[PDB]
């Protein structure tokens, strides 16, 4: 679920998902069009694609379980949708962690008109 993803993001990065990742660049929080602005925004682009891989799942609301094995995120077995959603979220949280070194506050609340053109998954 979105709330679970937000907790995973905070655990991983120390940033609150709202507002650090809810309106960032072209793809974080309301993704659709544009060239991703930076590596963090590319995490969101890929995460959007990952959810797009699951048209008959409901990643905003469906809850999954996971645990930590010495820092590592381990998705625990639920329904097929839950497992796949968890793997998408895990990857994005890791990606955000890997790209904190270039996170830029200037991309928070990024205006829609600066995001143009389709980019295929």
């Amino acid at each position: 679920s979105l709330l679970e993803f937000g907790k995973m993001i905070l655990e991983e990065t120390g940033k609150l998902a709202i507002p650090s990742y809810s309106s960032y660049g072209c793809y974080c929080g309301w993704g659709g069009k544009g060239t991703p602005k930076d590596a963090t925004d590319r995490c969101c682009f890929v995460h959007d694609c990952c959810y797009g891989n699951l048209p008959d799942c409901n990643p905003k609301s469906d809850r999954y379980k996971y645990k930590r094995v010495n820092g590592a995120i381990v998705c625990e077995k639920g329904t097929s949708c839950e497992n796949r959603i968890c793997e998408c979220d895990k990857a994005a949280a890791i990606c955000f962690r890997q790209n904190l070194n270039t996170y830029s506050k200037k991309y928070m609340l990024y205006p829609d008109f600066l995001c143009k053109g389709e980019l295929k998954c």
Binding site: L2, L3, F5, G6, I9, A17, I18, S20, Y21, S22, Y24, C28, G29, C44, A92
Partner: peptide, 4 residues
């Protein structure tokens, strides 16, 4: 309320 609705995040990432």
């Amino acid at each position: 309320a609705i995040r990432s």
